[PDB]
Design a protein around this ligand. Structure first.
Ligand SMILES: CNc1nc(Cl)nc2c1ncn2CC(=O)Nc1ccccc1
Length: 164
């Protein structure tokens, strides 16, 4: 059902993650980690302390879709296992140097055509698919966007809830 999902999404904050390639979203799904530019890293660290849940909604550029969404389970931490991100042009491993741990809530795709009815007040009420990496999505829009994804019945939200 959708009852545990709705409980996880209660009073969450939502951020749009735009990845340049599929490899890094694949790596993030396998290892439960994400990294972003320092300006977004600062915003996510602030948000993590302020809300019961911080939700990352992933979209690979040019794919026409979202590739799933995940919950921050920590602030960014430096050092540790060194993620072999595939770096876009102009990206260095230092720009992507802060590493967050994430718990996946849905690993399924959602095509942009299914979200055309949702607009984001925090981006001039443009459709929610439009936004730069790190764009915050307002509560109601973000909640409805997450509810549009196909259910991912491989994930048990019980352990996710046992972290909030
Ligand atoms: C693992 N993390 C990421 N992996 C990928 Cl592939 N793209 C990402 C990631 N975090 C943000 N973006 C979008 C982005 O900032 N692109 C970019 C900006 C400026 C110069 C070059 C490329």
């Amino acid at each position: 059902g959708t009852s545990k999902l709705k409980y996880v999404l209660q009073d969450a904050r939502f951020f749009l993650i735009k990845s340049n390639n599929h490899e890094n979203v694949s790596l993030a799904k396998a290892k439960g980690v994400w990294s972003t530019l320092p300006v977004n890293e600062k915003k996510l660290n602030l948000a993590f302390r302020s809300a019961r849940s911080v939700i990352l909604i992933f979209s690979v550029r040019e794919s026409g879709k979202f590739q799933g969404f995940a919950r921050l389970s920590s602030e960014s931490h430096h050092g540790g296992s060194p993620i072999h991100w595939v770096l876009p042009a102009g990206m260095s491993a230092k720009m992507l140097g802060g590493v967050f741990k994430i718990d996946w809530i849905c690993r399924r795709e959602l095509p942009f055509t299914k979200s055309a009815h949702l607009t984001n007040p925090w981006n001039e009420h443009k459709p929610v698919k439009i936004g730069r990496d790190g764009q915050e999505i307002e509560l109601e829009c973000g909640t409805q966007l997450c509810l549009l994804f196909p259910p991912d019945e491989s994930i048990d939200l019980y352990q996710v809830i046992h972290k909030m």
